[PDB]
Symmetry: C5
Subunit: 147 residues, 5 copies
Amino acid sequence: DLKGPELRILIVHARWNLQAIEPLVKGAVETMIEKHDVKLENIDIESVPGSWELPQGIRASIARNTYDAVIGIGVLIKGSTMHFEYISEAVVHGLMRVGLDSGVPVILGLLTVLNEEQALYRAGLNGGHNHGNDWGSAAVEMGLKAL
Amino acid sequence: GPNPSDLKGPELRILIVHARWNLQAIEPLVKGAVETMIEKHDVKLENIDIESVPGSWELPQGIRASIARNTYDAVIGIGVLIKGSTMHFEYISEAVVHGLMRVGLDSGVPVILGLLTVLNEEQALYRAGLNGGHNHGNDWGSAAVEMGLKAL
Amino acid sequence: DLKGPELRILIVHARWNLQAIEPLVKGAVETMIEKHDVKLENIDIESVPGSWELPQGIRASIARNTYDAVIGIGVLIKGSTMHFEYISEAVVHGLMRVGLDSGVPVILGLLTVLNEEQALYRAGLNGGHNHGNDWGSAAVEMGLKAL
Amino acid sequence: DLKGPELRILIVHARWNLQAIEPLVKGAVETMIEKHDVKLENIDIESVPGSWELPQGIRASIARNTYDAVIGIGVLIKGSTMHFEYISEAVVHGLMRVGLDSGVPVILGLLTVLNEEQALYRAGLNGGHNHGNDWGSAAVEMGLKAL
Amino acid sequence: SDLKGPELRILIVHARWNLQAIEPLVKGAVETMIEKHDVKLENIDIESVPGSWELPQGIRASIARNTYDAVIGIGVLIKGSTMHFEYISEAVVHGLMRVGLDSGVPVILGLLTVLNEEQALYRAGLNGGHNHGNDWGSAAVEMGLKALY
Ligand SMILES: O=C(O)CCc1nc2c(=O)[nH]c(=O)[nH]c2n(C[C@H](O)[C@H](O)[C@H](O)CO)c1=O
Ligand SMILES: O=C(O)CCc1nc2c(=O)[nH]c(=O)[nH]c2n(C[C@H](O)[C@H](O)[C@H](O)CO)c1=O
Ligand SMILES: O=C(O)CCc1nc2c(=O)[nH]c(=O)[nH]c2n(C[C@H](O)[C@H](O)[C@H](O)CO)c1=O
Ligand SMILES: O=C(O)CCc1nc2c(=O)[nH]c(=O)[nH]c2n(C[C@H](O)[C@H](O)[C@H](O)CO)c1=O
Ligand SMILES: O=C(O)CCc1nc2c(=O)[nH]c(=O)[nH]c2n(C[C@H](O)[C@H](O)[C@H](O)CO)c1=O
């Protein structure tokens, strides 16, 4: 039972596919507060237009304030072009780079799905499990293991 | 779908670098991005630099050279890559996307992705606002503004 | 036929798919000790939530203490979405970066499999060969060649 | 159009699939001279064994002399193995990196084709358009815009 | 490459997986440098690592200790039942390129990424095939010389 009452957590989420995003953020937040004793005031929630802006939004923010862990949340859905494949690959490498450059743990809350249904399912709707909960716990653990 | 903001950035300086391959698709995109920033975000026509480079490959290099000279709050890279008979499409696309992300992370300047990676001309025009489609350039204009302001 | 009684080895493993993980960590440890004379107290074993946290957990750890070699262990199983493909590529690139940035050898103990059975087989179950043993020996060898 | 009489241009080309390389190099050189007023003596032409050496050859050369733009030319043809895929991806990333690290424009004159015919076609043979011409103009334009 | 490099120092790092294919490759590279380029046997260091994954790391370690004019990374990756082959191949190739560009020392790609044993042995000069190690040897010499001059 890892508890982190003094942890400061940053959550940056995109706004594309908001119906999937919200449940995810909510799940992450609730899990941190109700199961890890993270204080609501210690959780900054910011947003960016799309998943492409995620790495950049996170970099800008951890350069201004101090956080123990960050969760980047976005939802990319495969469309008719190759856009999905290239953005996904670039965003994932980007998130990894910002975390390794900064030394701050960056939790991956990015869904790269084939359709809307797959995303809602992983957001806890239609019988699925909310992955945001798993992300919230990972943030806490990684924040503590960094001291 | 997208979800842009109301935000006004009258003091923002925005740079737009676009390639010149597949111009019929490029113009509508640039125009949409410009009009949106001005008409919906109060960005000033004089505060918007527009430069061009031959193809999408030059996009990351052109942007890097330009943000080294002047000061911008946000940059929009615009290009259109269409799948051809070889594997060129795949490798250029991957390298350019990686490149744009690197330039933005190295410089700290927000780089908005206005790159279309399509299978045919039709898909490009559709995303440029023609034949009943939605002009993506608009979304890009709003993204530039939002990111420029959040970089304070 | 290399012995490394003075080597300090770090092992960071994820916790997703633990049935596959344990045998792998165990085989790596036993091999180092029993065939390479590595000392039980010279082996640190840490864990992180998932494979994504692997590169970050390793970077944080080799920045605190001094190790001669590190072994990153995790198991990624292909699911219904593209997540598997993007996390795999990013983690592998990430582990290579940490090793090249630090000068500390990073042994790849990441299994990227299509299903659970393939992972267990490579962990020594159902008639397979435990790959953790090979990773144990590789850690020792690289630890020594780094002087 | 654009004229660059004072521009210094470097051309590094591989030697695999020479029958396709030559027309490309020639077309690029002629275009720069005849349409952009670049001076023949201001154009260095070097070669490396294969496309893999391209990024390294260019890096070495631009560290020695001063150029306004570089053109990397090579031809990779898909074979029976996956070699083609991995080298292609690595070389293309390498070229972009060398250009971004140095600040010197690097023009992509790499053909990644499925067969010999596709390469000859893009080199101006069998009714096709020589791509070397486009690369020559790009080098000139980027050299000037770098001032 | 009709080039001669009698003063060149060459490093060869090879993995040990699929040794039956590795050996002919290493041997062909060495013989070619010596017999056709006048490289001196004592100027050629040969080191090994467990697998292809360790190649970039072994090379980086070595070129930080001694001085070489060119390096040849040799390894054989064969496609198996999992995705391992695809991800390791990609990471090792990027890794070798990075080590060469970071250090300024030319790195010759002697990595085979094949679908089966036969393809590897063929490219190693067996069963009527051409030994690719020879081309790598010549490439190493040429790039070493062009880095000095
Ligand atoms: O499928 C595609 O890639 C095309 C449509 C699209 N989709 C998404 C998305 O699904 N999720 C997302 O999170 N974003 C999507 N975006 C936006 C992208 O992150 C970025 O904000 C813009 O490129 C401007 O820089 C999209 O444009
Ligand atoms: O399909 C291919 O890749 C071949 C044709 C081609 N297409 C484009 C394009 O579609 N969009 C683009 O934006 N560019 C294309 N280019 C050009 C390329 O970005 C670059 O300017 C040159 O390689 C020289 O540096 C192309 O050459
Ligand atoms: O298949 C997928 O990629 C989706 C499910 C999933 N699987 C794994 C896994 O298989 N192995 C793993 O080792 N991890 C998996 N994870 C977790 C992931 O490493 C990380 O902990 C979070 O993304 C937040 O940073 C997963 O979420
Ligand atoms: O399909 C393959 O990749 C195998 C055959 C091969 N082809 C080429 C090529 O087609 N073009 C090329 O330009 N090069 C090819 N090379 C050589 C490669 O760039 C490099 O010089 C060597 O790996 C040693 O460093 C090749 O080896
Ligand atoms: O196909 C796979 O990737 C699975 C089996 C496997 N194969 C090779 C190989 O074929 N060649 C190789 O050269 N190596 C292989 N390795 C080992 C790998 O380079 C590394 O030494 C370990 O991961 C520990 O760091 C393998 O594990």
